[PDB]
């Protein structure tokens, strides 16, 4: 008889039973390893305050996301704060750097915000109008606006404006500053003398313009500037500084490319020709005393 076999079978069967019991304690160790969600690189800091300078006042030392709640506001909201080595904390409300967000948006979207906020500042967005209104008119401490631009060659230039403020929605988020405080990007907000019309410069300036979008026209043109240029801006028949324009790669573009024939790029006339669109843009405010 072949019972020598019935031998090795019980042998094998008992082994695999013990193999199983152990295997199972190993699945139990595995499972405990697979309970945590993926690490998200984006975190939101814990300091808060009226605005980013206030955050910076409280010792915040790094750029990234924080919540703020302006005196006027009834609900805090997330913002991207840029804090330098010297203690300045800028509140960034606009950013452009690749053409990933469509800035052709409606009144509501411009009012509430659209785009994304990133710890690293590597994302496009429009903070909304209502927020820029609550931050900048919250207290008689005047803010300054800083416009930063970057061309397709690595060049950067800036433009500052004093006592920057955005009106309420009752007044169509009217933009206003007291004066240009300097910068090598030049003062496109002051209008530009493009050519022959003697009234060029008056019609392309932006101080005192209400905001406009394709569906809520408040410009100084019998037509619809925003609808024609595809953006949301403080349009005046129509503009000389337009940072919410169409994003064109490589900067140079021409009427042919445009859809209506007019210059609809990310332009800042006093620094480069309207047929050249910026690579990057940044719009950000700071209590003006930070620059006095």
């Amino acid at each position: 008889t072949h019972d020598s076999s019935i031998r090795y079978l019980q042998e094998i069967y008992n082994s695999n039973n013990q193999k199983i019991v152990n295997l199972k304690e190993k699945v139990a160790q595995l499972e405990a390893q697979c309970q945590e969600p993926c690490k998200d690189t984006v975190q939101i800091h814990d300091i808060t305050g009226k605005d980013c300078q206030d955050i910076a006042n409280k010792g915040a030392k790094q750029s990234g996301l924080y919540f703020i709640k302006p005196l006027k506001a009834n609900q805090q909201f997330l913002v991207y704060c840029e804090i330098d080595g010297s203690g300045n904390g800028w509140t960034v409300f606009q950013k452009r750097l690749d053409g990933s967000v469509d800035f052709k948006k409606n009144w509501i979207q411009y009012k509430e915000g659209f785009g994304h906020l990133s710890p690293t500042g590597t994302t496009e967005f429009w903070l909304g109008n209502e927020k820029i209104h609550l931050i900048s008119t919250q207290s008689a401490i005047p803010y300054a606006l800083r416009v930063e631009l970057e061309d397709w060659n690595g060049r950067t230039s800036t433009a500052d404006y004093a006592m920057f403020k955005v009106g309420p929605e009752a007044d169509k988020y009217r933009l206003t500053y007291a004066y240009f405080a300097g910068g090598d990007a030049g003062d496109a907000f002051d209008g530009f003398d493009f050519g022959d019309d003697p009234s060029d410069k008056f019609f392309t300036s932006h101080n005192g313009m209400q905001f406009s979008t394709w569906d809520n026209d408040n410009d100084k043109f019998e037509g619809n500037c925003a609808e024609q240029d595809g953006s949301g801006w403080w349009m005046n028949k129509c503009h000389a500084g337009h940072l919410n324009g169409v994003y064109y790669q490589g900067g140079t573009y021409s009427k042919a490319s445009t859809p209506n024939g007019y210059d609809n790029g990310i332009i800042w006339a006093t620094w480069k020709t309207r047929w050249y669109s910026m690579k990057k843009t940044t719009m950000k405010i700071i209590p003006f005393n930070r620059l006095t």
Binding site: F203, G223, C225, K237, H239, D263
Partner: peptide, 4 residues
């Protein structure tokens, strides 16, 4: 730009 300007619109005439």
């Amino acid at each position: 730009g300007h619109r005439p």
